[PDB]
Amino acid sequence: AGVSEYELPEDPKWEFPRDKLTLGKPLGEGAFGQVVMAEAVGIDKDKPKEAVTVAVKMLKDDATEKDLSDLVSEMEMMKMIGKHKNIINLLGACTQDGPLYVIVAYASKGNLREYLRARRPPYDINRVPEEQMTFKDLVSCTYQLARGMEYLASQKCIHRDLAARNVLVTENNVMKIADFGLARDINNIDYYKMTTNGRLPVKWMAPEALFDRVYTHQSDVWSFGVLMWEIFTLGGSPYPGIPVEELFKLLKEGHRMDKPANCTNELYMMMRDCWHAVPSQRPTFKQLVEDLDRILTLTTN
């Protein structure tokens, strides 16, 4: 839909009244949208006079048409995806007679990369030493995210932008996949066809997307492997020292990232399996969940 003449249809089951929403302090500014904390009175049907803290995604003053298209697409993707423990929860939207607000559950511990970096083993005033990550914590993080993606893939949707920056962490340390603005519905098609030059960060893109312009669930599996590497480096950035302009040829030559310091060979081989050159030889998200559960069960004892 061309947003400059598209009028958002009514969808009463998701609509939230503007007079019940009080916008608060900013939580983030990316480039296509901005997210603010807010108080939503009555958005929990079970506590109808109660104000609950939420996060609201909206356009910036300098928004483009594509920014608005992405915000609509993110809202519609979250509607169709449905509910899961490891997917950030869509609560409602203000869509009629004013700016588009997409209202989502608030994750008080912020994005995953900064959450991990603040909990690294020993000047940063943002560190949280009382919550330093153990190996079991890292495996648990990975397992939760694999469960979220297993659910996502069972809904026949591809995220396409999986990365630590697009994961949120709640007060109870629950991992929440977020930022569905690039996600797509691939029900009834065999693969999603990429344009010539996409809007997906190159360092998380599977080679078949990069070079053959195709995206499947197994392309998300590749990105999940990079996400795993981010987790087990406690928020490191991938292919360190390699600019994206040099990475294309390195990937064609079979280059893969080295093993992170805090990782077992078992977990590194799981990353490497996610980075198999042949998409159908990478594990599925169902298989990753099974393997991570077994590792996590052994670790917790």
Numbering used by the authors: 461 to 582, 588 to 766
Provide the authors' original text about this structure.
Receptor tyrosine kinase (RTK) signaling fulfills fundamental functions in development, tissue homeostasis, and metabolism of metazoan organisms. Our data reveal two clusters of hydrophobic interactions, termed ‘DFG latch’ and ‘αC tether’, which relay allosteric signals between the A-loop and the molecular brake. These hydrophobic networks, located strategically at the interface between the N- and C-lobes of the kinase, sense the structural fluctuations in the A-loop and molecular brake and undergo rearrangements to determine the kinase interlobe angle and hence kinase activation.
To test this hypothesis, we engineered the following double mutants that combine mutations from two different sites namely: molecular brake and A-loop (E565A/K659M), molecular brake and DFG latch (E565A/I547V and E565A/L617M), molecular brake and αC tether (E565A/D650V, and E565A/M537I), and DFG latch and αC tether (I547V/M537I and L617M/D650V). In fact, the activity of the E565A/K659M double mutant nearly reached the maximal activity achieved by A-loop phosphorylated WT FGFR2K. To provide structural support for the enhanced activities of the pathogenic double mutations, we solved crystal structures for the two most active double mutants (E565A/K659M and E565A/D650V). In agreement with their elevated kinase activities, both double mutants crystallized in an activated conformation displaying an active A-loop conformation, a disengaged molecular brake, a weakened DFG latch and an engaged αC tether. Note that reminiscent of the A-loop phosphorylated activated FGFR2K, the molecular brake is completely disengaged in the unphosphorylated K659M/E565A double mutant. The hydrophobic interactions that the K659M mutation introduces to support the active conformation of the A-loop are represented by semitransparent surfaces, and the hydrogen bond between Y657 and R649 is shown as a red dashed line with the distance given in Å. Taken together with our extensive structural and functional results on single mutants, these data on the double mutants further support a four-site long-range allosteric network that controls FGFRK conformational dynamics and activity.
